[PDB]
Amino acid sequence: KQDMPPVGGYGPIDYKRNLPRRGLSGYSMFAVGIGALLFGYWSMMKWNRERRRLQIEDFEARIALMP
Amino acid sequence: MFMINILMLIIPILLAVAFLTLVERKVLGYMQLRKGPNVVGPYGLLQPIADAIKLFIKEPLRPATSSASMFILAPIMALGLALTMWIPLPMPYPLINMNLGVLFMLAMSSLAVYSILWSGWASNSKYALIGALRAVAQTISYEVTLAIILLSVLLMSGSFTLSTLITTQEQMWLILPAWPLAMMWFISTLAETNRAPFDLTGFNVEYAAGPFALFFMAEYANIIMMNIFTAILFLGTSHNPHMPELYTINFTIKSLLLTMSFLWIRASYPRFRYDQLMHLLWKNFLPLTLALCMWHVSLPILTSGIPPQ
Numbered sequence: 001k002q003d004m005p006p007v008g009g010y011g012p013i014d015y016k017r018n019l020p021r022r023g024l025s026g027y028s029m030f031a032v033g034i035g036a037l038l039f040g041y042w043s044m045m046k047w048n049r050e051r052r053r054l055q056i057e058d059f060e061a062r063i064a065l066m067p
Numbered sequence: 068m069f070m071i072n073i074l075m076l077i078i079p080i081l082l083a084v085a086f087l088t089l090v091e092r093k094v095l096g097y098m099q100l101r102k103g104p105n106v107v108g109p110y111g112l113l114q115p116i117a118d119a120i121k122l123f124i125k126e127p128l129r130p131a132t133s134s135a136s137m138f139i140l141a142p143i144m145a146l147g148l149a150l151t152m153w154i155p156l157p158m159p160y161p162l163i164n165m166n167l168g169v170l171f172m173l174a175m176s177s178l179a180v181y182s183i184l185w186s187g188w189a190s191n192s193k194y195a196l197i198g199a200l201r202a203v204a205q206t207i208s209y210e211v212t213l214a215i216i217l218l219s220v221l222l223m224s225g226s227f228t229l230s231t232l233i234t235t236q237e238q239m240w241l242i243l244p245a246w247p248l249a250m251m252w253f254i255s256t257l258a259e260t261n262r263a264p265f266d267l268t269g270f271n272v273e274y275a276a277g278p279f280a281l282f283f284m285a286e287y288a289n290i291i292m293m294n295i296f297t298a299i300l301f302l303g304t305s306h307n308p309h310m311p312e313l314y315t316i317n318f319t320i321k322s323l324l325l326t327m328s329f330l331w332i333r334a335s336y337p338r339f340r341y342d343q344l345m346h347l348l349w350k351n352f353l354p355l356t357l358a359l360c361m362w363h364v365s366l367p368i369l370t371s372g373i374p375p376q
């Protein structure tokens with residue numbers, strides 16, 4: 001008399017197949033790429049030109065002496 | 068006491084990778100829901116010291132089908148240049164102040180393909196004769212993909228020497244103007260040093276317990292070197308003259324994360340099936356490399372932002 005089949009309690013689990021967790025698509029990408037890229041170029045011309053100012057300063061001490 | 072600086076760089080870098088085959092597996096371990104070395108360590112840390120003893124106990128039988136003058140010649144150069152390439156590298160002070168050294172790294176790494184052509188050829192037949200050829204044939208294709216985009220950042224940094232490279236990146240983290248180059252830097256360097264996605268890599272199977280360990284010890288020597296070479300180039304750190312110690316604290320710890328990346332990419336991906344593997348260089352990589360080579364010339368001109376030297 002002690003056999004298995006239970007009265008209730010069932011799901012089931014799915015046979016489904018989906019995980020569309022997107023994801024900033026469709027022209028939202030290529031937008032964070034370009035602006036941060038020119039931001040790095042914007043970081044230039046305030047350092048290389050600044051080091052160029054120090055570069056003439058470095059060559060200044062050479063020319064002032066040597067007579 | 069110049070000599071004691073030498074021995075306190077060659078010897079403390081061997082334990083830097085002899086204790087990495089441990090770290091190779093444990094990082095591989097805790098992805099697969101499994102633990103590290105459990106019985107010997109206790110925390111693993113007593114494992115590779117015993118395994119290093121075994122390969123010099125176990126008998127190195129020699130091939131009767133090969134020469135001897137050529138067969139041990141390739142492990143001679145294997146520790147030769149793959150350790151010599153460490154020398155003009157700053158932390159923050161290099162051992163040698165070379166006036167030009169970025170060419171010097173490529174000059175030494177171009178002889179890495181000149182070692183694999185030895186061991187497969189002088190040994191034996193088929194596998195060691197044809198199979199060892201193709202591996203040169205892939206690794207000859209990754210100097211042109213390496214050296215060109217290398218040259219495109221010297222146009223903006225300023226010169227050839229490496230000591231000025233720290234000062235010019237003191238505010239930048241120069242991946243930000245070269246994040247397209249950051250892929251083709253790291254992909255190409257991954258492919259040359261013979262690792263898991265870019266692998267086809269008989270040039271090992273003939274080596275017994277003696278000289279297999281060298282061409283396992285030299286190959287690992289390369290991989291932290293392409294980590295430490297990308298480290299000074301892309302992800303530059305801050306410099307303090309009055310506190311040199313604080314440099315090296317946040318220097319190797321950044322290279323150690325990128326060291327994990329070779330261990331981390333290995334746990335994801337399959338191979339590339341050799342006919343595609345060169346086809347994805349010429350057809351695909353190389354036209355973008357020429358385009359960005361033209362890009363970093365016009366833009367420092369059309370900024371009046373030429374780097375001084």
Ligand SMILES: CCCCCCCCCCCCCCCCCC(=O)OC[C@H](COP(=O)(O)OCCN)OC(=O)CCCCCCCCCCCCCCCCC
Nearest residue numbers: 033034246247248249250251253254264336347351352355
């Ligand atoms: C106009 C403004 C100026 C211009 C700005 C424009 C910016 C553009 C920036 C582009 C630069 C990056 C692109 C470089 C090319 C990337 C390589 C590539 O895309 O190849 C695609 C590869 C080949 O196959 P495919 O052609 O796609 O054909 C199958 C089609 N279903 O198919 C693939 O997709 C496979 C991917 C390559 C396989 C290797 C992947 C291994 C994983 C590497 C992980 C890298 C992690 C990031 C890098 C580390 C960071 C340092």
